[PDB]
Design an enzyme around this catalytic site. Structure first.
Site, PDB file in Angstrom:
ATOM      1  N   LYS A 282      35.233  55.646  40.779  1.00 22.37           N
ATOM      2  CA  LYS A 282      33.810  55.606  40.166  1.00 22.37           C
ATOM      3  C   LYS A 282      34.362  57.009  38.765  1.00 22.37           C
ATOM      4  O   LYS A 282      35.356  58.056  38.936  1.00 22.37           O
ATOM      5  CB  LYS A 282      33.348  56.639  40.763  1.00 22.37           C
ATOM      6  CG  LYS A 282      31.367  57.034  40.748  1.00 22.37           C
ATOM      7  CD  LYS A 282      31.055  55.746  41.429  1.00 22.37           C
ATOM      8  CE  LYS A 282      29.219  55.543  40.899  1.00 22.37           C
ATOM      9  NZ  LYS A 282      28.525  54.227  41.827  1.00 22.37           N
TER      10      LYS A 282
ATOM     11  N   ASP B 250      26.576  51.606  36.207  1.00 20.14           N
ATOM     12  CA  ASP B 250      25.359  52.684  36.940  1.00 20.14           C
ATOM     13  C   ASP B 250      24.286  53.179  35.838  1.00 20.14           C
ATOM     14  O   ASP B 250      24.001  52.791  34.954  1.00 20.14           O
ATOM     15  CB  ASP B 250      26.526  53.512  37.981  1.00 20.14           C
ATOM     16  CG  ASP B 250      26.282  54.020  38.933  1.00 20.14           C
ATOM     17  OD1 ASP B 250      25.373  54.086  38.971  1.00 20.14           O
ATOM     18  OD2 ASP B 250      27.089  53.273  39.516  1.00 20.14           O
TER      19      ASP B 250
ATOM     20  N   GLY C 266       9.666  49.524  46.885  1.00 23.12           N
ATOM     21  CA  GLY C 266      10.661  50.232  45.828  1.00 23.12           C
ATOM     22  C   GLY C 266      10.311  48.472  45.334  1.00 23.12           C
ATOM     23  O   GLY C 266      10.146  47.507  45.613  1.00 23.12           O
ATOM     24  N   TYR C 267       9.509  49.115  43.742  1.00 18.18           N
ATOM     25  CA  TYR C 267      10.057  47.142  42.930  1.00 18.18           C
ATOM     26  C   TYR C 267      10.196  46.850  41.632  1.00 18.18           C
ATOM     27  O   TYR C 267       9.818  46.699  40.701  1.00 18.18           O
ATOM     28  CB  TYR C 267       8.122  46.443  42.613  1.00 18.18           C
ATOM     29  CG  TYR C 267       7.606  44.986  43.227  1.00 18.18           C
ATOM     30  CD1 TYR C 267       7.792  44.540  44.087  1.00 18.18           C
ATOM     31  CD2 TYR C 267       6.855  44.684  41.634  1.00 18.18           C
ATOM     32  CE1 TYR C 267       8.000  42.975  43.586  1.00 18.18           C
ATOM     33  CE2 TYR C 267       6.739  43.428  41.587  1.00 18.18           C
ATOM     34  CZ  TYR C 267       6.886  42.357  43.125  1.00 18.18           C
ATOM     35  OH  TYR C 267       6.553  40.803  43.314  1.00 18.18           O
ATOM     36  N   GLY C 268      11.782  47.712  41.397  1.00 22.14           N
ATOM     37  CA  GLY C 268      12.603  47.244  40.855  1.00 22.14           C
ATOM     38  C   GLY C 268      12.583  45.952  40.877  1.00 22.14           C
ATOM     39  O   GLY C 268      12.653  44.840  41.351  1.00 22.14           O
ATOM     40  N   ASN C 269      14.317  45.716  40.128  1.00 21.99           N
ATOM     41  CA  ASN C 269      15.265  44.245  40.444  1.00 21.99           C
ATOM     42  C   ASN C 269      15.040  44.064  41.428  1.00 21.99           C
ATOM     43  O   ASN C 269      14.684  43.012  42.101  1.00 21.99           O
ATOM     44  CB  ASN C 269      16.140  44.556  39.651  1.00 21.99           C
ATOM     45  CG  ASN C 269      16.763  44.169  38.224  1.00 21.99           C
ATOM     46  OD1 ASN C 269      17.927  43.639  38.323  1.00 21.99           O
ATOM     47  ND2 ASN C 269      15.919  43.605  37.677  1.00 21.99           N
ATOM     48  N   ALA C 270      15.550  44.548  42.733  1.00 28.58           N
ATOM     49  CA  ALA C 270      15.904  45.263  43.793  1.00 28.58           C
ATOM     50  C   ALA C 270      14.837  44.369  44.491  1.00 28.58           C
ATOM     51  O   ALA C 270      14.767  43.260  44.795  1.00 28.58           O
ATOM     52  CB  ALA C 270      16.821  46.004  44.264  1.00 28.58           C
ATOM     53  N   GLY C 271      13.715  45.452  44.240  1.00 33.18           N
ATOM     54  CA  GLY C 271      12.272  44.934  44.793  1.00 33.18           C
ATOM     55  C   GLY C 271      11.789  43.958  44.543  1.00 33.18           C
ATOM     56  O   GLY C 271      11.575  42.959  45.161  1.00 33.18           O
ATOM     57  N   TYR C 272      12.197  43.582  43.389  1.00 32.53           N
ATOM     58  CA  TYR C 272      11.123  42.272  42.364  1.00 32.53           C
ATOM     59  C   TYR C 272      12.247  41.079  43.069  1.00 32.53           C
ATOM     60  O   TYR C 272      11.253  40.287  43.485  1.00 32.53           O
ATOM     61  CB  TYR C 272      11.152  42.753  41.459  1.00 32.53           C
ATOM     62  CG  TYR C 272      10.873  41.093  40.692  1.00 32.53           C
ATOM     63  CD1 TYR C 272       9.722  40.666  40.474  1.00 32.53           C
ATOM     64  CD2 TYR C 272      11.653  40.585  39.912  1.00 32.53           C
ATOM     65  CE1 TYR C 272       9.405  38.772  40.852  1.00 32.53           C
ATOM     66  CE2 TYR C 272      12.000  39.250  39.405  1.00 32.53           C
ATOM     67  CZ  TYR C 272      11.101  38.698  39.433  1.00 32.53           C
ATOM     68  OH  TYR C 272      10.347  37.296  39.028  1.00 32.53           O
TER      69      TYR C 272
END
Lengths: 417, 417, 417, 417
Positions: A102, A142, A217-223
């Protein structure tokens, strides 16, 4: 070290469910290599400013270290250390030939120009060149870093290495013009979808078609999760939320539309034909599947008792706390733990490297199919132990991960017992 | 970083006696690269144990970093960082084509066996290999490390590099069988001796012959200094001491006999025909030259006042405090600041590296004569600024040092101002 | 090739005076290696601008190639090839363990900023990295480049090579803070002085003391020469000139004082302590020694006949044409040809390289002394053939040079006859 | 540059149809890297002979450069630069992870012996070693070079590189005993067949079965195409020709049988089972498909008007001039431009490289199948733009190509706009 302190702890727990020497344990508590460098950046004003940066390689027993670079003003070494260790576990659970790494830079990117951001990026590679290699340590994007930043870093690496090595393979999350892979944007969601699909199975579900899911949540993942579950699964997305609020509708929402709405108004909030809700409220809905995809510690001591989903798909990292876990288990709610659930990103990142090192690129279909196979297997590896030892899926996930890292350390002779 | 913290000061202080930008100051305050590694050692019991080591490269603008490796149970990164910055000033003051570096292992060497010590030494090299080279970073012995340890480290380096590079040149302080240099043991004392000699000259002394010197400390350096000043310069050594106390004899002592007595007895104490004194008294005798060559902070606020010596040759590191500095400066006493005074060791380590990379070894005479030239020059370099700016010698020493490093940084374009 | 053609010409001439195969000749007429690259530079306005660069490696039979880098709006590859071949003869005449190389960038440096210059310099290195090394091809400054430029080039090299090879040794003409050699500024003048000294000896002069010299050109070369010939040899510097004109004084000028005048006024012209003359007149003075140290082709068929000096020391490159050579030669004028006369510069660059690779630095006196030895030797090597064959010194110089390259090629097996 | 000039021309054209910065354009007009070397060869008579060689690396934004080596008495650097730029467009149109490169040696191979050829081939590698690698620049055969020549070049590479990198991957077109790929001989023809197949589809044809084709040229390309179109597609090969002339038969020729005739007699001309025609006539036949697979500029302003085919598959390089393109385009003739049509060869060379670097070899069927996919894709990528913009296919092909290179450069930060 607070955050670092937390890992050692997670490490200590798993140990109670498996056999591992103290030798192995002590070794795992410490990262094998840490590099910390000073990066001088010529600012646009013609002065140089220096930034502090780090690259931490926690463990490479199972293969080259893998893991993102964070650019952030409150970054610290402890955090970077804690996160590298987490990568060690995630790569192992997915059975990838990688270890965990990381990195981070202590900077506020909003203050830098693109020219300055580019300089910073290249400077990071110039500073750490000696400890990275397509067969040694492969970064990725990241917090606050992205494909553009990956591209600059790759280019600098190609310049120093002189094209004597497969330079595209030094780092992932690249733009497609130079070695990026298809499937990257949807990777996490897509990966989580397969695990949900297997959870339903074990659970005995007839199908997912028609089942309900609430996504926080409605980000990339969310969406993307919303979209896949809907169009590919036949599920009903009755609710979604954003940092502002959630929204409800039992006839089920439309991913894209909700999406534009969000675009236009800045919140999922008020979408037409739907009831506004709080986040709290969202978590407590009576749904088949709750998929927390935003921030951590949303499921706690407090509300744990009120969760009503059958399946908790941890998309986000650290959504459910430790005491909440216990309640949930006891309640008969099946959790798909974070590091397993959202591992679709690292996996596709792994497929990116394969394509870069072999020089042969894949189709979106091949990507998805191979991701499906990997996630399914991983899912079972965990499920099986969990069931076999009658333990919580998360504990079971550490057991599988730790045991694989441990066995590789033993075969190499790093530890004798 | 208490210690490190200390160092920042020194930098800020010298800054007031010269012009240098904030750009450069800021750069100088952070070490360029740090590497922290975990070294697993197979113990004699068959189990593996892990140790924490570091290698810090503070600044390499003037050339490859140079500096010892300390083995010590109370080692910290802060300290190692602090000692690396110091090596930067010291190499610069001596005008060597090197920057500063330093390493450390947190370990209690008294508990390891020889085989275990060997494994640890080799493990350190196996861990930091990528950041060392005969033209990159050259270690050496320090606290609890020695020629033996150096040899095992070189051997392992040679094994990894495949003899494709001048391996003897990777580290100094080696045994003569494998590239060590003659003059290594007397180096510190020998160096100091030339500085005392020029100091007498600037002070008008006629000759050193028959002058008196008191030496606090009777190890290698105290002992060799005693031996040199007397035998080579005709000075009278009226008092020397060890940790258990001093001896006084106004007719001058015989270094060797004192040495012999100490071995046999444990202390210089009770040497026949001499008078026992306290260390504290030793520092107050009235001698021409006082050379503190034991521990630090022996001359302070409290006693600076009592110091009677014309010249104070700081052989040990930090024997005189800052408050004490002010006073002695006031009193018109001439101080030869540690890092200038005792730089003969780094200096000969430089000569060892030269012999290794060219493959041509020198005689002790050649060694001694090049050491003289170097020491003599570094002395006047410091002395001239001192006078000319009418500042303390120590202040002038930082000025000479920082100015060189700063200039190299600018020439390279690392700072634009 | 015109410029390049002129080289074949030269090579075909020496061939008259020596036996050499066609195989060799033909090999010699072509450079072994040429690299032409496009260097993109991020300009201050934030747009990218591309520049064309080259590095020509004529012949490396005798050792790594050596030669400067020119920055000039009208550079052409033909010119760089031609100048690389010249370095081949020059290093050979001096008996240095080098071959000849040369580079250039087509640019008008006068329009770039420092930031922009820095970036173009680092860019060239990033572009030609693969074909340079301390044992392969070592550049240096030339038209429009200087120590600052060299410094940035070394720095970039160091960053790409990772400090695994002696980086200071990659290029010469560096600043002293980072590996530069003492003696660099006076090198040319200084080297020419030794040649003048031997030419007088072979001429049967008694001493130089009291003899007279006229110097055309009042740059570094002209000034230092004037300075040296007077102060070190006791010659009378009766006239110096610049592009604006000359000054004369039969009693001798004082170099420094003329320097200062020039500095304030811009020309040596009008110096109070002398009378003004023209450049043409300067060439025709009746002096013991005439040293054209400005530009080429100042002695031609036109005035060759008016030359009154006994020794013509060619400081500048090509000040006398071939037609003039014939005339002077019949007249019994001894010419010290350019490539021999002004070789002290490359020679001191050779010394810088030695100090860098061995890590041991010399004093100005060591520099001077070794320089002397080199120059004296080269002078007689040339002088002896001329005498023995009754040939022009220029012709003898090519003979000495070519034969050495030719023989190194035969020994390597590059040519068989 | 004439040849080189023609490239700028081409590049300036696509620019009409797309938005691209000047910064980019200018970068694109110049090759990034050129190496010109002198190769000495020991001749059979035991004398040494020097030859001139080059390797041009136009642009490597998208990946390692790829391109053949030509051996020809009239090679010039302008031509090689021009052909390197072409490879850049070709690899991009095909979406391969490569850039374009090209090499040449000015030699008449017809006068060398095998021993001499071998030595020239190994010599070129020994001369350009530093700038090639499996991940840097991969050559292949071309005018006057072939698998045997490639084999010797790989062998020398292997010997210099010491087997530390995947050597078989340094160059393509190798013999099968050492890493060559199945499918190499038919590659070109085979790739063109898939393009013909899609062009018919987009034309609304029903099938190819029973359609007719005329092939100009009866080399590898002409013969295999004839062979494939008939046997695999069921087309009627009504006419083929060679430099001596053409033959015709409305019922269809039998490719193999014509091959054998040609083999004994030297020309397809006079084949008993057909009537003779001229090349000019061949171009004017009334066929469904016309495939010029011989030389350039056979369709010009002169006869463009007489072309009767519905599809013109450009097998050869540049058979149709720009003036003819206009005419055919207005006439509704669909042209499959050369660099797209004949790209199966580079594509199969790309596959050879993959097999070499991964160590896993494919079957002819795998080769064919992947080839098909690549070609089909490239066809539509081109076809879609042409349609959408109503532009000539050739123009659409440059648009597709340039944009991809342009975008990879922007992403790397090579140009900022």
């Amino acid at each position: 070290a607070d955050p670092y302190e937390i890992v050692i702890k997670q490490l200590e727990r798993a140990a109670q469910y498996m056999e591992i020497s103290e030798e192995a344990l002590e070794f795992l508590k410490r990262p094998q290599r840490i590099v910390e460098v000073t990066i001088p950046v010529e600012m646009d004003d013609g002065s140089v400013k220096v930034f502090t940066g780090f690259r931490v390689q926690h463990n490479w027993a199972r293969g080259p270290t893998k893991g993102g670079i964070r650019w952030h003003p409150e970054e610290t070494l402890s955090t970077v250390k804690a996160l590298a260790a987490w990568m060690t576990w995630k790569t192992a659970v997915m059975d990838l030939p990688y270890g965990g790494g990381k990195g981070g830079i202590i900077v506020d990117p909003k203050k830098l120009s693109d020219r300055e951001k580019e300089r910073l990026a290249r400077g990071y590679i110039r500073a750490i060149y000696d400890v990275i290699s397509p067969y040694e340590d492969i970064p990725a994007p990241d917090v606050y870093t992205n494909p553009q930043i990956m591209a600059w870093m790759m280019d600098e690496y190609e310049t120093i290495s002189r094209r004597k090595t497969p330079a595209f393979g030094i780092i992932t999350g690249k733009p497609l013009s130079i070695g990026g892979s298809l499937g990257r944007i949807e990777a996490t969601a897509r990966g989580a979808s397969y695990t949900i699909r297997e959870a339903a199975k074990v659970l005995g579900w007839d199908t997912l078609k028609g089942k309900t899911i609430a996504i926080q949540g409605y980000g990339n993942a969310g969406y993307y999760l919303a979209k896949i579950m809907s169009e590919d699964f036949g599920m009903k997305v009755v609710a979604v939320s954003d940092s502002k609020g959630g929204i409800y509708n039992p006839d089920g929402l439309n991913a894209d539309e909700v999406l534009k709405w969000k675009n236009e108004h800045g919140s999922v909030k008020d979408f037409p034909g739907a009831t506004n809700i709080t986040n709290e409220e969202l978590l407590e809905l009576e749904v088949d599947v709750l998929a927390p995809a935003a921030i951590e510690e949303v499921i706690t001591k407090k509300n744990a008792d009120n969760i009503k989903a059958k399946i908790v798909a941890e998309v986000a990292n650290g959504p459910v706390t430790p005491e909440a876990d216990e309640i949930l288990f006891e309640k008969g709610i099946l959790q798909i733990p974070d590091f397993l659930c959202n591992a679709g990103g690292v996996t596709v990142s792994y497929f990116e490297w394969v394509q870069n090192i072999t020089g042969y690129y894949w189709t979106i279909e091949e990507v998805r199919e191979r991701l499906d196979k990997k996630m399914t297997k991983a899912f079972y590896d965990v499920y099986n132990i969990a069931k076999e030892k009658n333990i919580h899926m998360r504990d079971a996930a550490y057991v599988v991960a730790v045991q694989r890292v441990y066995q590789a350390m033993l075969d190499r002779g790093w530890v004798k017992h």
